[PDB]
Design a protein around this ligand. Structure first.
Ligand code: BGC
Ligand code: BGC
Ligand code: BGC
Length: 362
């Protein structure tokens, strides 16, 4: 059979060999900055699950440089406070996992600063709650920025000293999210909310169902379950995951492979190329929590076999090994966007999603 730990290492090595920039402490500066934060999450989570510490020096290097005040948003004063609330949220959650891996309170302190910075754009006057994604414009309350923020306060409710205020915020944020309408009739989450012209009421904007908007919410509900031991949080998360796994909903192919809607038209952009790996790792979080909340041996078996099925398909159809030279000894694996499709090229967002699926099976 396949060993997920060794393949995640080969994928991380391929990510480093092709896309890591030593002089910048960052992967692929020609790609979105927030995807470097997702890549850091993948590498950190690989270490926690595999017990290795093989990239810890590299991770601390990336952290220390990306803490600095961003050149495109100096008013954030660094600590990953960017010009978008979801950009900040990706690095904030990576710092929660960095704290989980090392126990260094420094990384939890970043997460706390990030929560307070993100909360500045939570608003009760439009849509009765939720925060904006575009800090500069304040025109869009979308699913991903509010899912990241919800997972952040739910994580801090389990780790921070003033844990009670973060629990009240997480419980209040989930209540708003559930009543927002972004969760539709088949228990899937559209992209965000639109605002009525005359009335000012908000409603599901019916924009595409992206895989990473069905994943981050699972981790948030798992963290809310850990903070409350209320299994109804796991039940809501399971209904969202079951909808993704149902081939009738168009996200799981007839082969049982997770498929982004943009893969059909071959039009997945730099953002959408990383979505699947985010869902896979969050589904592994849901599976681990489900198996720990009951005594049935097959508890969470469907989520684990789904991750295994997607691993083997992408292992077999989406992989390409880098060829070593007389000068470069680097070895590893590269991956394209489609887990059940051909390998044409490899980009950093595609590679980061790749690692997330392997780490989800460790
Ligand atoms: O505004 C979004 C930001 O995205 C990042 O990936 C880029 O590196 C910045 O130059 C840009 O300002
Ligand atoms: O690619 C899809 C993503 O595009 C971004 O510009 C939007 O802010 C997100 O809400 C959306 O999920
Ligand atoms: O790009 C997605 C669009 O979604 C709409 O629901 C929002 O009202 C816009 O502000 C946003 O730009």
């Amino acid at each position: 059979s396949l060993n997920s730990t060794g393949l995640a290492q080969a994928a991380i090595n391929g990510l480093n060999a092709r896309f890591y920039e030593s002089s910048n402490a960052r992967w692929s500066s020609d790609e979105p900055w927030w995807i470097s934060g997702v890549a850091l999450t993948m590498v950190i989570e690989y270490m926690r699950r595999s017990g290795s510490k093989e990239y810890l020096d590299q991770v601390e290097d990336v952290i220390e440089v990306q803490r600095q005040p961003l050149s495109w948003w100096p008013s954030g004063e660094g600590e990953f406070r960017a010009d978008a609330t979801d950009d900040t949220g990706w690095w904030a959650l990576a710092m929660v996992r960095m704290y989980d891996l090392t126990g260094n309170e420094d990384y939890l302190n970043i997460s706390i600063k990030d929560e307070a910075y993100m909360r500045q754009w939570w608003t009760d006057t439009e849509c009765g709650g939720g925060l904006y994604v575009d800090i500069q414009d304040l025109t869009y309350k979308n699913a991903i920025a509010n899912e990241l923020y919800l997972k952040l306060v739910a994580s801090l409710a389990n780790r921070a000293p003033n844990a009670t205020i973060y629990l009240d915020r997480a419980q209040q944020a989930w209540t708003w999210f559930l009543g927002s309408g972004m969760i539709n009739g088949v228990n899937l989450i559209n992209d965000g909310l639109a605002r009525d012209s005359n009335t000012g009421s908000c409603y599901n904007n019916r924009l595409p169902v992206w895989t990473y908007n069905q994943g981050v919410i699972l981790g948030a509900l798992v963290e809310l379950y850990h903070a409350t031991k209320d299994e109804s949080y796991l039940l809501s998360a399971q209904a969202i995951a079951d909808a993704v796994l149902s081939p009738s909903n168009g996200l799981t192919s007839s082969s049982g492979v997770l498929t982004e809607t943009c893969e059909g038209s071959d039009s997945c952009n730099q953002d959408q190329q990383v979505f699947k790996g985010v869902f896979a790792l969050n589904l592994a979080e849901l599976g681990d929590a489900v198996a720990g909340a009951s005594s049935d041996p097959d508890a969470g078996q469907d989520y684990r076999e789904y991750l295994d099925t997607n691993m083997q398909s992408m292992y077999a159809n989406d992989r390409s090994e880098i060829v070593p030279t007389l000068f470069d000894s680097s070895t590893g694996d590269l991956y394209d966007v489609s887990w059940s499709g051909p390998f044409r090229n490899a980009t950093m967002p595609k590679q980061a999603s790749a690692i997330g699926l392997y780490v989800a099976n460790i």
